Symmetry: D2
Subunit: 249 residues, 4 copies
Amino acid sequence: GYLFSVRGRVACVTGASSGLGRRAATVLAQAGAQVVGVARRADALAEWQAEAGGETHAIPYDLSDRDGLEGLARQVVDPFGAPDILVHAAGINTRQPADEVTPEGWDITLTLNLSVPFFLSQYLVPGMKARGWGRIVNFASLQTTRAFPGGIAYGASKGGVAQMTRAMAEAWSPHGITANALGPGFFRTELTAPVFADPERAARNAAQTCIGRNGEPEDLDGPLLFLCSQASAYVTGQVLMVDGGYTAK
Amino acid sequence: GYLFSVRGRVACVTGASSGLGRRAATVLAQAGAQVVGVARRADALAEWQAEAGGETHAIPYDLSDRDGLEGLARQVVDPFGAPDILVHAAGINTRQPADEVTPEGWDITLTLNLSVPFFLSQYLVPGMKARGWGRIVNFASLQTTRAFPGGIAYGASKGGVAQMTRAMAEAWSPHGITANALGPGFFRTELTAPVFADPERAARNAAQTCIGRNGEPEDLDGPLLFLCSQASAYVTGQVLMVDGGYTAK
Amino acid sequence: MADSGYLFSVRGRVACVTGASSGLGRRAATVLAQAGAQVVGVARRADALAEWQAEAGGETHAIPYDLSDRDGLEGLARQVVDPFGAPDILVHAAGINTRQPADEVTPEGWDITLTLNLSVPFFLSQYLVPGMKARGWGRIVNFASLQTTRAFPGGIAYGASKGGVAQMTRAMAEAWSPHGITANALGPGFFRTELTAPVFADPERAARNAAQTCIGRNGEPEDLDGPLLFLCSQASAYVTGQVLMVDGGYTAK
Amino acid sequence: GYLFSVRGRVACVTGASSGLGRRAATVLAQAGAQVVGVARRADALAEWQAEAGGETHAIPYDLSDRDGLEGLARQVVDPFGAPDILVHAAGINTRQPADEVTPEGWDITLTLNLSVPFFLSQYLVPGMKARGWGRIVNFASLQTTRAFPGGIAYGASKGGVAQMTRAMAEAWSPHGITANALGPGFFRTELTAPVFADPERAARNAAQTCIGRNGEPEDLDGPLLFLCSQASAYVTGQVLMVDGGYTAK
């Protein structure tokens, strides 16, 4: 049971003001990790801190600013020290189908979904190396493997994430840092507004799973804590789909 | 914490007299499940029961006898009631290269590794359906995806296990039964004796992982309990590799 | 034809195709015979085999044999080599789907699916590989499925077998490709055959499956020709241990 | 039994001055396609043209310049009319290990290996759509799936490529355009000089394949022509590994 603890660890979670990142940041805080939540909007982070309890700190930062990311990383280590756990839950889907992709929509998708996870990890790994222990949790997608309408830049980024996660393990796992990717199926969030707003679409997606339902926020708590804890010490370089068996059918 | 509990559950573990099945059976028992361990040898099962503590029951049975499996299933329900968790860890690798495969070595490999998991599952799922809750844990392999010397029947069986696991989810997960496969990399057991007996070979395999070491028995505890608990309710039809990132390189 | 077109030649090769009386096996056997291979077709029924030989043209030979008979496979292999000499190309197109859902699977329906779809491909290949090794050249083509990776209703024994096939194909390559023999699996999507009668018989089903592909249609027989000949020729010399999906992009969505 | 013809087609091949791109452009020229070859250096493009024979046109262009891509596309259509076949063989591997990745090295790899193929496709697909027929050939890698030393940006890009190819099929294959990726193993080129320069490394990689050898230029011809012809009309969204079975072990 100790096996699954994150008590006394330090975590940084990006995308912590909404969606699955907010859930992850709250789970980790309620499980006793000290949590640094990063997202654009101070007011949304303050509501997060109010719900989350435990011991947290908020940092408003626009993760589309890559030049500033090394300064963010210094901010991240200030409240509680170097993080042991890093969760890259910030992300975007512009939903531009191929013929309508703009340079701007392509670029913001690769920046936020792929490049920012890489560099923020690069900046934060030294502290983990020093302790000989770290957990990196990237966010893969059904669109790591299956192309959906409007998804082309998103799936490019998310096929990138999976290989990036393997490459993170190849570089950093000899030093005690594991890197894996949670692959949520369809959960009600900001990214999935069209999939859920049309109920016929939502129900088709539910029927595509083996269980027969879409995801609820609580469905990610277990797999998150597993990937953030001693339980997963020999699991690295893997994508763990949390999708009710969508990918089995 | 409670998310990862197996207290009050009943598990059946095949292959419980040695190797990874014995580890799984012990972990489950120490974690508060009632465990029914199935293996060929009574004396080996009795040593298991002695190591394990908790509440367990041993059933000596030669799982190559498929005609008898329905009777085995009735034996398995008798000590503690119908199992909630089933772990198919019994297996064989005859190590016959393709040109030397015999009908008998082929057939015993398919029987033990593929057909027995299916039928014992078939017999034991009714009790899970009645409760609307179940966990099936199959054993996949690096040879689900990568062909090793002497491996052809083994890999046929383990490729089959991966797809069988997705098919178990498609059949059974509407009823609250999840089916997943643990994919150990190289752990010191009965099946892996040549991989370990030559140290140069053992070290090449260790170097193929991201972490740089082969598996130890404790490395499977976390992933097992995750796959046997509430924590993985929305995880079904998946193969979860516990291989130190062997498959990432 | 460009000189490189001759990379895809099967002229003067010997092929054995199982399942040659119907479905995709029959198309594969006919394509190879029309492309100038000498083709040994294996199937249960002498009469359906005769219809095949009539359609095919070229140079062919029929062998009626019940591939559920593993005992007799070594004697099949002797029969296969008799008309044209040892085959250079082996195509394992015989297969079954009993469509029994998990709760209704019988020992017999599980068993016949593993026999025909997995064990027979293995043993027949084992018996015919020596001839290929003697020449330093061979092509094995197995049949994978959408159900190599995605579980469909009634599919559980079939999927077990087809996930098996994929790994078995990797293992055939690991054992035999040092000797000049490549082994790959074609993965057809949904094509109109014996095995897919329920998928097609309900038009709404057929259309949902067409819409699941990227192109928007189910398979037609001729769609298998190119991929088959590629996997049976010099063109694929450095392609081994692979599953080649011919599914209109079903598996991309 | 022609099916595999490219006679009469127009092809655009990027990276046509060296390596596998140069092989592809020559193969397609010698098979009777009119070929537009795109690469940085006029003089190396001119040697190519001399070597190739057939009917060709060279366009010197720095593919790191995304701003000018729409203009390149106009140049590409000028000599022979709109291309039917597009082969994205230009690529880079900076070989920076994770801890030493620079923003510039990461950016150039995503640009050349992922963003350029998307945009140049986007600009050239209209011509294909008008005819109801096209073929797009991307370049995947062993690092689509397996992380090698120095590979992290490359691998990010190439996992991106494979999803991008699936998403290209989803967008464009209803209009007669197929999109697939060739996945070469290890062939003697600019990208792979350290793998080949050290003979012990070269031999280890050869031994990792099923056949037991590295690739030769001619090994790409058949798989290329298959992906560029009528033969592959019902093959779309696929990665076709041309690796001697590296990925089977």
